[PDB]
From a paper:
Six β-strands, β1 (residues 2–4), β2 (residues 19–22), β3 (residues 25–28), β4 (residues 70–77), β5 (residues 100–105), and β6 (residues 115–122) are aligned in a single sheet, and two α-helices, α1 (residues 45–63) and α3 (residues 80–92) are packed against the β-sheet. The surface electrostatic potential map shows that positively charged residues predominate at the entry of the center cavity, and negatively charged residues are dominant on the opposite side. The surface electrostatic potential distribution of the groove shows a positively charged surface patch comprising Lys78, Lys111, and Arg108. From the mutants study, we have shown that Tyr16, His18, Lys39, Arg101, Cys103, and Lys111, which are predicted as the potential nucleic acid binding groove, are important for the chlorinated SAYabJ performing ribonuclease activity.
SAYabJ is classified as a member of the typical RidA subfamily by sequence analysis, and all six footprint residues (Tyr16, Ser29, Asn87, Arg101, Cys103, and Glu116) are conserved. The crystal structure reveals that SAYabJ exists as a compact homotrimer, which is consistent with the results of size-exclusion chromatography. We first identified SAYabJ as a ribonuclease that is activated after chlorination.
Numbering used by the authors:
A (entry chain B): 1 to 124
B (entry chain C): 1 to 126
C (entry chain A): -3 to 124
The structure:
Amino acid sequence: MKIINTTRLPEALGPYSHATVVNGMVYTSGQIPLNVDGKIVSADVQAQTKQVLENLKVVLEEAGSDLNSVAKATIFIKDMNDFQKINEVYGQYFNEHKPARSCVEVARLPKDVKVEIELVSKIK
Amino acid sequence: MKIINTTRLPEALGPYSHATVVNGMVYTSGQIPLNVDGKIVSADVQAQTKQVLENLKVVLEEAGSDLNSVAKATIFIKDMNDFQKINEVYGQYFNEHKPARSCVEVARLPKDVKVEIELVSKIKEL
Amino acid sequence: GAASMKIINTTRLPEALGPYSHATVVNGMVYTSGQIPLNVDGKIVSADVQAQTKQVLENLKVVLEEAGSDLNSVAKATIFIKDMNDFQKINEVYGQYFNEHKPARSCVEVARLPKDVKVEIELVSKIK
């Protein structure tokens, strides 16, 4: 069991970590579109999707993995009408390597963000 | 990292794959009740549940797993008042083998379907 | 032919009625079913959200123990909730259980939970 916490990201306040690594796999926390100051970056859903994926890129790096090693993503979104915008940004991060995915519209996310994404990835 | 795609499902057009296999485990994408032509098969929630599970069966089999090898299912539904009906269909597929599961009602699913199911399963004999 | 794993169903909790099990153990990981706040008699324990969160975490402690795991071995939790206004109260209880070890987590507001409960939690854990 390894605990992954990096000051390269907005701190996990309270009782969670950015990721764990266990049995050769990285389990990330859900990322939301905060910058390193813990501010929501934009109201724009594309901009939020980018911040999320950038944050996750960092977690994967710090955990000993990368984007091309991701097995599964779960995308929780506030509006399914944003799906095409989100998908466009997501497809910039997952271009050649295409993980398994689920995407659902939830009722509400932390801090009223529009998109939250969690990954399961293999250690390199 | 093995990427799984099967021509018995509608083509993964978009940045995903029907499933991946990593460390002897299969992670499927969430399946929705589309046939191979990308069309929703029925409005009926039981017919949708059946199509989801048949779609998952083909993904598992293409990956070298099967429904009896499932570790965990997550069932996202549009209406909890349909739970017992969805449950009845799911129990026809998971009769002998009873994996772990969660089931929650979401606000909306892709293409306004009523049910989406993802699975984590183990590869047979390796 | 089926891939080898251990199915967990303990008499310490209300039976999983129908086509699921309390947990599975596969390739050194425990996958729990989502736990809702049912008491030893199978009933919703209380309307209070902190009582429900306690009951969920105590149920999950049971499942993890019976599977050969423990809270210190959890990789990832997902907390599904009915109302983000309960998050502070839920988090206060969660943090009492995950005080020394802090797993990866996601928390989302869903439209509805089984039995109209306010919180449901699932875990993925290592064998201890």
